[PDB]
Amino acid sequence: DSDIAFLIDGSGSIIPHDFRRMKEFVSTVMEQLKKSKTLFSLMQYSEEFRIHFTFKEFQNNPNPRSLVKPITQLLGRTHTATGIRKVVRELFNITNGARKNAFKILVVITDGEKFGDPLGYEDVIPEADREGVIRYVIGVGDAFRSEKSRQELNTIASKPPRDHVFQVNNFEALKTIQNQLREKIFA
C-alpha cells in the first residue's frame, strides 16, 4: 500500500544531541504512521550513504524505535541530490522489499544546503517524479531562514511547496511539525 522512505542528513554540523532529536522525531512519526500495509525504510547521508533498514527488514521487524535507536551519525558534508538518487534507485527497489504499485513517499530532513555533491538536483529530481516518488522536506535551522535557501527546499519537494515543504528553527522544534506531516502523508 504505502512505501515510506526517510532520507536523513547526518552531516558534521548536526551536534550529537540534535542528531538524537532527529532520531526521536523519525521514530515518533514512523510509529504514528504504522499500519499493516505500510512499510518504512531509511537512508542516512552526508558525503556517505547508509541504508539503516530496507522495507523488507522493516517488514520482518516493524519496530521503529528498535530500528532507529542504534543509528550513528556519519558526519561529513551534504550530498542531498545523490542521497535522493540512491533512495529512488535503491530504497524503492523491489529487491529491497519495495512493493510495485505502492504509493512511494520520501521524507527528507536536512540542516543545510547541498554542498560538495557531484550531482545537481536537475540530475535527480526528474527521475524521482518519473518513478512517482512524492517528496516532503523539512529544512531545519539557520540554513533555511532566508528566501534564497528556501528555494532549495522547494526544489527537493513535490508540488506545490506549500503542501510538501516544512521549515523548523531547530531540531528541538521538529515536534512542532509532527501532526502536520502525518496528516499530509495520510491525505
Q: Which residues bind Mn ion (CB under 5 A)?
A: 11, 13, 111-112
Q: Whose Cβ is closer to Mn ion: residue 13's or residue 93's?
A: 13
Q: Whose Cβ is closer to Mn ion: residue 11's or residue 82's?
A: 11
Shortest Å, Cβ 81 to Mn ion: 15
Peptide bond into 160 cis (omega under 30): yes
Classify the C-alpha dihedral 137-77-174-89 as positive or negative. Answer: positive
Q: Whose Cβ is closer to Mn ion: residue 14's or residue 91's?
A: 14
Q: Whose Cβ is closer to Mn ion: residue 58's or residue 171's?
A: 171
Shortest Å, Cβ 25 to Mn ion: 16
| Nearest partner of 8 among 33, 34, 30, judged by Cα | 30
Q: Whose Cβ is closer to Mn ion: residue 49's or residue 55's?
A: 49
In this structure, what DSSP letter does residue 158 have?
P
Kindly list the distances between the CA atom of residue 55 and the CA atoms of 3, 11, 104, in Å, as whole numbers in the listed order: 7, 24, 12
Shortest Å, Cβ 115 to Mn ion: 8
SS3 107: strand
Classify the C-alpha dihedral 39-100-10-113 as positive or negative. Answer: negative
Shortest Å, Cβ 131 to Mn ion: 26
Give the number of residues written for the chain: 187
Phi-psi region of 35 (alpha: psi -120 to 50; beta: other; left: phi over 0): beta
Shortest Å, Cβ 174 to Mn ion: 15
What the block records as the C-alpha cell of 125 is: 529530481
